[PDB]
């Protein structure tokens, strides 16, 4: 599955400039009208402010924790199109709709899948290999008004990725901290081999 298809429903990472407060979407090492990745790191195109590694990584971590908190807000939605009730209440049956007479199935509005894909989307933005191969989810479409006029060359992207490897690895490490705690990841063979426990 391509990153475009996998991350179609993910929220784009938005960074706020520490100097001029302008917010812009961050799409890795790509051409943008709002930021430039130089040999020294990420730079805001509006005021030319260079981001320190801490300024970047803190915003990423804040976004991650915001998504986690949203997940644990625990909003549920009925899957019946006629009812469609949205509530944070959980019945003792869990999946039973709380609206009287409804047989729909309650589901998390923000699922563990959506959160996991969101975290992976954040991880992908700081993957050096994906940046070099230009396999990231695009933040601009060619028909968008904010589509950058000047495109970075493949050679320039590879050079900028190599030059910013430490920064990209630091950002990725922040994401990986939370991904390692995500329950949606691993597969336990010990429990799985219950037939040998026949």
């Amino acid at each position: 599955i391509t990153d475009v298809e996998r991350f179609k429903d993910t929220v784009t990472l938005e960074l706020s400039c520490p100097s001029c407060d302008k917010r812009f979407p961050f799409g890795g090492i790509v051409s943008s009208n709002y930021y430039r990745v130089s040999y020294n790191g990420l730079q805001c195109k509006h005021c030319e402010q260079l981001f320190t590694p801490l300024q970047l990584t803190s915003q990423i971590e804040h976004s991650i924790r915001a998504h986690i908190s949203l997940y644990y807000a625990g909003w549920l939605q009925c899957d019946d199109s006629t009812c469609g009730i949205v509530t944070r209440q959980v019945s003792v049956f869990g999946k039973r709709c709380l609206n009287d007479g409804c047989t729909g199935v309650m589901r998390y509005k923000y699922s563990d899948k959506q959160l996991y894909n969101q975290l992976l989307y954040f991880d992908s933005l700081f993957d050096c290999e994906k940046n070099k191969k230009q396999e990231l989810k695009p933040i601009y479409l060619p028909d968008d008004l904010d589509y950058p006029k000047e495109q970075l060359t493949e050679s320039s992207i590879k050079a900028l990725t190599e030059q910013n490897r430490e920064l990209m690895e630091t950002g990725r490490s922040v994401v990986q901290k939370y991904l390692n705690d995500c329950g949606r990841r691993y597969v336990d063979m010990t429990s799985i081999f219950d037939f040998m426990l026949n």
């Binding site: 520490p18 915003q59 971590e61 908190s69 959980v90 019945s91 003792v92 049956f93 705690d181 329950g183």
Partner: protein
């Protein structure tokens, strides 16, 4: 002129052909190196190929571009405000060993801090809540309370019936307080309350509550309750009487244990200090106040135990949320992550705490240094914080632990603020709210009995909340089935210290206010257990045990930070 002659004064006059000039100019502009640097690297390139005819042709320059990128990537690879019991108990003198330089092993005056929970159960993976598992926990809560109520009031199992079914006879019903409407709009009144039953008790159905016959009540969402009443018409369960939930038992100790704890302190009083984050203001990351506090801790106060509640690095801090983190000129190397920020700011300060002071750290769900972002929450990783093993202990949230004979119950979630009560009656309304909330916590036998958890929104966008992992809420219950002697739940509300049902309930308040002004911390003095002074209550049994009665022999001072 300039680039052409610069090339022709390093490369030969053969470079005068403009394509060659353009290619070399492109290289110097691409890689920022000067013309003479490019000439030097061209000379490096001319070596090692047996190519005496390293002529300045277009193809040779293409190979030189490839060589330059190989060299580039290889170089990269190389490279007192308020007080409880002030009139009866003097402030402890503290730990006499604090301030003594002596490396000698701390032989006699060893306050023992021991966790009273299974730490492994808190190391579950987050961000994966199964709705069926969550519902199972919620159902089990109702069933557990049904058993407690049945045993306490000596009721038969047949006395309990489904409150949703029409009955002319009075029945007993246990369930969870829930809103009458699933889409309720944040304000609950007594007329908008329903009772959710367990799967076994009422097949999980909800029934509206008619509380007209009840004069005094205090209810909140998620509360487990027991009622005696009837459903005459099938539409609403008319409550005739509320059955008060029994309080949990108090902790006890043997005579031998109490004598050992008395000998450990040599008859002196225990001194415990409790602080709660944040530890810096909303507009900066200055820890000057914390440094001053630790200096006072080490030289004047000299506590036996220091309990520090997070958040140490609040992820919702305004400067973090806006990305406006400052430069730290005091550091040779700037921090790159919030974890490194802790290691550069907090760790040097915390390491100055005297090794004779046992330091307990309890995380917050807002703490950036914790990857376990859900309540219940795993302990901080002490090694990752580079804190010494000798006197630092990282505990879970909530945490139950024992200091000598005294059982401490700690929860770093703001239950006092989050618990919104639906009240009726003059007597209930005249009582202090935080007492009623404390009683709710004790009766429910859980540090955070609210369900669904609280959320904070801004103009709506979700900001934060209690962040409850519902499948693991069993870990938030009182450990061992008894209340703590001292319950500490930090809250954004005003600091307080109170005795509620023989439990000392403490909110230390915030260490520092948002504006940078001083906040508050709690100083707890507990007199030593004495079998002869009559402050302990003997409970008769096969083995004589004693109630600690910490509330009779504890002083709590709320002090400006």
């Amino acid at each position: 002129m300039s680039g052409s002659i610069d090339v022709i004064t390093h490369f030969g006059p053969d470079a005068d052909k403009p394509e060659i000039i353009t290619a070399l100019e492109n290289l110097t502009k691409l890689h920022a190196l000067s013309v003479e640097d490019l000439y030097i690297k061209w000379e490096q390139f001319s070596n090692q190929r047996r190519q005496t005819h390293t002529d300045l042709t277009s193809k040779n320059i293409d190979e030189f571009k490839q060589f330059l990128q190989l060299q580039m990537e290889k170089r990269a690879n190389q490279i007192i405000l308020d007080s409880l019991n002030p009139e009866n108990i003097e402030i402890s003198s503290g730990n006499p060993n604090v301030g003594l330089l002596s490396t000698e092993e701390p032989s006699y005056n060893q306050v023992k801090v021991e966790p009273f929970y299974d730490a492994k159960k808190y190391k579950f993976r987050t961000m994966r809540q199964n709705l069926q598992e969550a519902s199972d926990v919620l159902d089990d809560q109702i069933e557990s309370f049904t058993k407690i109520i049945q045993n306490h009031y000596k009721l038969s199992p047949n006395d309990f019936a489904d409150p949703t079914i029409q009955s002319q006879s009075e029945i007993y019903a246990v369930g969870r307080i829930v809103p009458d409407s699933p889409t309720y709009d944040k304000f609950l009144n007594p007329e908008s309350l329903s009772l959710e039953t367990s799967r076994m008790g009422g097949v999980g159905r909800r029934v509206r509550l008619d509380l007209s016959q009840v004069n005094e009540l205090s209810f909140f969402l998620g509360q487990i309750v027991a009622f005696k009443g009837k459903n005459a018409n099938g539409d609403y369960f008319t409550v005739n009487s509320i059955l008060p939930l029994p309080y949990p038992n108090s902790p006890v100790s043997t005579s031998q244990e109490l004598q050992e704890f008395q000998a450990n302190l040599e008859g002196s009083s225990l001194k415990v200090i409790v602080t709660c984050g944040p530890y810096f203001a909303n507009d900066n990351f200055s820890l000057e106040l914390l440094q001053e506090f630790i200096d006072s801790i080490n030289n004047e106060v000299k506590p036996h135990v220091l309990i520090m509640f997070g958040p140490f690095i609040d992820i919702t801090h305004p400067l973090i949320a806006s990305g406006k983190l400052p430069n730290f000129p005091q550091f040779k190397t700037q921090p790159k992550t919030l974890d490194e920020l802790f290691l550069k700011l907090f760790t040097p300060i915390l390491k100055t705490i005297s090794p004779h002071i046992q330091t307990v750290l309890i995380p917050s769900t807002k703490d950036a240094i914790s990857n376990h972002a859900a309540y219940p929450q795993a302990s901080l990783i002490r090694k990752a914080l580079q804190l010494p093993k000798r006197n630092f202990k990282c505990m879970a949230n909530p945490s139950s632990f024992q200091i000598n004979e005294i059982y401490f119950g700690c929860s770093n979630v703001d239950t006092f603020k989050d618990l919104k009560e639906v009240i009726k009656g003059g007597t209930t309304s005249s009582r202090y709210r935080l007492d009623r909330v404390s009683e709710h916590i004790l009766q429910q036998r859980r540090y955070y009995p609210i369900f669904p958890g609280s959320i904070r929104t801004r103009i709506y966008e979700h900001i934060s909340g209690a962040d409850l992992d519902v499948s693991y809420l069993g870990l938030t219950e009182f450990v061992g089935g008894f209340s703590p002697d001292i319950m500490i739940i930090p809250s954004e509300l005003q600091h307080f210290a109170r005795v509620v049902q023989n439990v000392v309930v403490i909110n230390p308040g915030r260490f520092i206010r948002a504006t940078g002004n001083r906040g508050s911390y709690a100083q707890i003095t507990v007199q030593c257990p004495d079998l002869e002074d009559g402050k302990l209550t003997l409970v008769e049994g096969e083995e004589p045990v004693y109630l600690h009665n910490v509330w009779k022999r504890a002083r709590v001072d709320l002090i400006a930070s």
